[model samples]
Target: LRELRCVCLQTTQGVHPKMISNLQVFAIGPQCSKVEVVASLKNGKEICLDPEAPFLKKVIQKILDGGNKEN
Candidate 1:
């Protein structure tokens, strides 16, 4: 499988302090119920993941259900 990450910025600490993480994933161009989600972010950055994992069904449902959750 491929790996991915997300970025979030912070507005504190002397004008340029920033924050990012390895635990969050934002997917774009969702093609659901298949083996690969082909997900991405607003940056147009993209990654591929398997939706057949059972737990990741939550990701596919986000676009349709209006909620995306992570641990």
Candidate 2:
């Protein structure tokens, strides 16, 4: 089993993602059936991603591995 803050949708455009500590929480969006990858910060700040932009997996991976292409 896995853990998550919640189950919700995050659909939209003009996404602006940021970093908050080394903690990252991956979430999803459905504002327009758009897929967005979010990271729940250690301070409880919801980083703004796209409405549902694609190819953000790499971004999350970097965050998890601290920008290391290889895990």
Model 2, 1-71: lDDT tens digits are: 35433433443232223544443344443332333444555566655454234545544555656545565
RMSD of 1: 13.6
Q: What would the TM-scores of all predictions be?
A: 0.38, 0.34
Name the top TM-score candidate.
1
Query: Where does model 1 exceed 4 Å of error?
Result: 1-35, 67-71
**lDDT (Cα atoms) of all candidates against the true structure:** 0.35, 0.44
Clash number for candidate 1? 3
Model 1 per-residue lDDT tens digits across residues 1-71: 35433222111111110111112343442332222334445545444444445545554444444433433
Off by over 4 Å in 2: 1-6, 12-18, 22-37, 47-52, 67-71
Global CA lDDT computed for model 2: 0.44
